[PDB]
Amino acid sequence: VPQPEADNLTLRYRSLVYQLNFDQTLRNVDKAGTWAPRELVLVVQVHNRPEYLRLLLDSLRKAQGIDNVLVIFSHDFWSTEINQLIAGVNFCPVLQVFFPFSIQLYPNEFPGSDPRDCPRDLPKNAALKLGCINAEYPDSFGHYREAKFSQTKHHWWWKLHFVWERVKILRDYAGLILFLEEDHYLAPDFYHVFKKMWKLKQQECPECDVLSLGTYSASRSFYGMADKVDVKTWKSTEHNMGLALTRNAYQKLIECTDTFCTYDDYNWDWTLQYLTVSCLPKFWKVLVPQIPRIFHAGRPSTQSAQIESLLNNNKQYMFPETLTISEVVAISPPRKNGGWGDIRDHELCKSYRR
Amino acid sequence: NLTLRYRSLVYQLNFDQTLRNVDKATWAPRELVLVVQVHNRPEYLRLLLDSLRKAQGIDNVLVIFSHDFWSTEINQLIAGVNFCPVLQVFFPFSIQLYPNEFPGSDPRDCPRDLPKNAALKLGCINAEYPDSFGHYREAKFSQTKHHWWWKLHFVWERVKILRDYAGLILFLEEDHYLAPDFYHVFKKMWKLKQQECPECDVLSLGTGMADKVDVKTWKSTEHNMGLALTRNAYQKLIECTDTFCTYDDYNWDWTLQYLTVSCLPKFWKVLVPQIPRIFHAMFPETLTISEKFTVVAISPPRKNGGWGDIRDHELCKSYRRLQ
Ligand SMILES: CC(=O)N[C@@H]1[C@@H](O)[C@H](O[C@@H]2O[C@H](CO[C@H]3O[C@H](CO)[C@@H](O)[C@H](O)[C@@H]3O)[C@@H](O)[C@H](O[C@H]3O[C@H](CO)[C@@H](O)[C@H](O)[C@@H]3O[C@@H]3O[C@H](CO)[C@@H](O)[C@H](O)[C@H]3NC(C)=O)[C@@H]2O)[C@@H](CO)O[C@H]1O
Ligand SMILES: CC(=O)N[C@@H]1[C@@H](O)[C@H](O[C@@H]2O[C@H](CO[C@H]3O[C@H](CO)[C@@H](O)[C@H](O)[C@@H]3O)[C@@H](O)[C@H](O[C@H]3O[C@H](CO)[C@@H](O)[C@H](O)[C@@H]3O[C@@H]3O[C@H](CO)[C@@H](O)[C@H](O)[C@H]3NC(C)=O)[C@@H]2O)[C@@H](CO)O[C@H]1O
Ligand SMILES: *[C@@H]1O[C@H](CO)[C@@H](O)[C@H](O)[C@H]1NC(C)=O
Ligand SMILES: *[C@@H]1O[C@H](CO)[C@@H](O)[C@H](O)[C@H]1NC(C)=O
Description:
The structure is a homodimer. Chain A has helices spanning 9-23, 50-62, 80-87, 124-130, 147-165, 190-204, 236-239, 247-254, 257-262, 268-277, 300-313, 343-350, and strands at 40-46, 70-75, 94-98, 176-181, 184-186, 210-212, 228-233, 243-245, 285-289, 294-296, 324-325. In chain A, strand 1 (40-46), helix 2 and strand 2 form a beta-alpha-beta unit. The termini of chain A are far apart. In chain A, strands 3-2-1-4-8-6-9-7-11 form a nine-stranded mixed beta sheet, with helices on both faces. The longest helix of chain A is centred in the middle third of the chain and has 19 residues, at 147-165. By secondary structure, chain A is an alpha/beta fold. Chain A is globular, with a radius of gyration of 21 Å. At the A-B interface, helix 1 and helix 3 of A face helix 1, helix 3 and helix 10 of B. The site of one 2-acetamido-2-deoxy-beta-D-glucopyranose (NAG) has 4 residues of chain A, from helix 1. It is classed as transferase. The entry lists the keywords glycosyltransferase, mgat2, Complex N-gly, Branched acceptor, transferase.
């Protein structure tokens, strides 16, 4: 009997992440057929909240007409319960990718917590004399790097480039890709509205850059507002939930990698808000329905019952026959939030494009 | 190192045991469980997956795929299965995981057709242990018997979803094609066993008329395509582990046939339909037992060799112990 291996957990997780990102095993699809991603592709950034991921999977199972829509789950943490919940999805194409620069893969070194890093609340005069690595590079508020807060911005930018230029099933994909999170709940007609939203964009809003499936403001009655969409300037605090990008819109973002990776803000949506006023050629105008088709559920069983009660009471207003645009200038980030002053985070973020 | 990466994948996936197409938050394995031994011939695996997709009423039957070779094309074929619960386990002592060492091809192993007097002077590892025909160990011929015996113990005592499973488990291979009514007949075969053949030990999907089944003395070489065992029938096999792992025959079915005539407490009687429901590449209303052969003798099968290396003996016996 062969001598067993030394149980290195971090080496085992890297092996799973590296192999699955290369194989790219596609679920519920017979590749020997003529299936290709079309119109819409869902990309979900997953963390470690299985109670909210299950709510998202329940909304997808109750959704209508998504039997051919590819749903990509981008993971930054390997978890048996997380992989088990997604494995139960058999009603639509499912793909799993793993962020290969997660803190779980690097415990004792960047992008994790290097033992020579400066503490968070250590003053600069003490850090310079101590001699820690990033002593000369704090953020705009004198705070130093924390690995747990920088991973989300790294993952969002890596998964944006990965699904557009590293996923072989999305080669030459000329549709839209919807970006949501694990703590989101999609309406049963979110795909029905998106198909009419994109047709309404190609006919009445040629200047619309991106699409959104709704804001955080929802009315108790969907009467008269369920078939209406608004054309507004993209605000990160109001349109960070369910963002649909195009191939042309993605190329404008990847051309702004240096500006995205150096902006001192660990929030990806606040950084995109700065892109509109700086590196992007113009600010973004978003197409969003007056009634949201996506909800932020963040107890799980309590907020889920309120969403399903809101959608059931207004079941008559969903799935509208026709959408109509109803009757706005740019907006700058009011304040940098810091957390992205370490140049090591800058260089790692810039390398995703290469 | 690719082989070192595969070892890491196998250890994690055999422990996690991710169950597909099942919402664990009220499904439990019942009646029948399918266990398929997969190697590295996707052209035949696709035929088996086409037969499963065309089968009737197997939406609740768990199909476990035991792999001895990691392949992107192989893993992609099974991921497309969305119509029944799917589980993937990996044989952790395969040649892909150990290329340059046992159970693979150790660089110090003796050649196949090297005489024993030359092997003793050369000093190769297994020089003192050739098979019954003067031939030495070949890794490619020992993997099938190693995988079959490990997979028998793993699905019965190491799969958490099959804990306290009080049903039957069907064992087939990647090069098999199931009839669309194989599960329809099995459900009536087990009902027909509980009513007209209390002495039937195991069931078979084939070796006449479409509604007739026969009761014969169980020969392993005649029922190696789609073999359904019970927990009591499984326990009889593991109690004969030393005889299975030391018998000089790399074929698992020839070894099981020798197990019946030399180690089993009593002979087995098998229920098999006259028309096979499995093929090596309908839907009757009622099944009726036709031919009922009495228990007759069975001669010791001629050994084919290929299982004389004691290293294969110890590894085969250790599967029940390793944890
Ligand atoms: C409606 C509106 O415009 N609200 C603004 C409000 O969001 C700002 O608060 C800051 O929010 C960001 C992240 O915002 C995301 O999440 C919100 C949740 O509601 C969303 O609404 C929003 O769309 C975004 O998705 C936080 O990161 C900021 O936190 C930092 O600053 C606060 C100050 O109280 C501090 O308490 C936090 O601990 C954090 O401080 C930073 O922490 C990191 C890591 O520990 C350090 O590296 C970094 O140096 C710290 N910086 C500072 C300055 O201490 C806010 O909560 C609000 C402020 O801009 O404006 C409202 O208008
Ligand atoms: C129609 C019929 O029933 N034919 C039987 C015939 O197949 C048997 O021959 C041996 O079959 C086994 C495998 O048996 C399985 O597959 C059969 C179909 O091919 C099924 O019919 C059967 O039910 C089983 O499912 C083979 O492994 C044997 O191959 C060995 O022996 C032959 C002949 O001597 C030799 O040419 C082969 O090369 C092989 O020899 C061994 O090879 C290994 C690996 O290199 C060596 O380690 C070992 O030392 C070699 N031993 C010998 C003796 O050379 C046969 O093909 C037949 C049994 O004799 O019964 C017929 O009824
Ligand atoms: C485990 O693996 C990681 C990365 O492969 C390595 O840095 C670490 O030293 C290993 N731990 C050991 C060998 O104990
Ligand atoms: C990987 O390591 C194994 C030993 O564990 C060794 O036999 C094999 O040759 C290595 N792979 C390569 C490509 O050398």
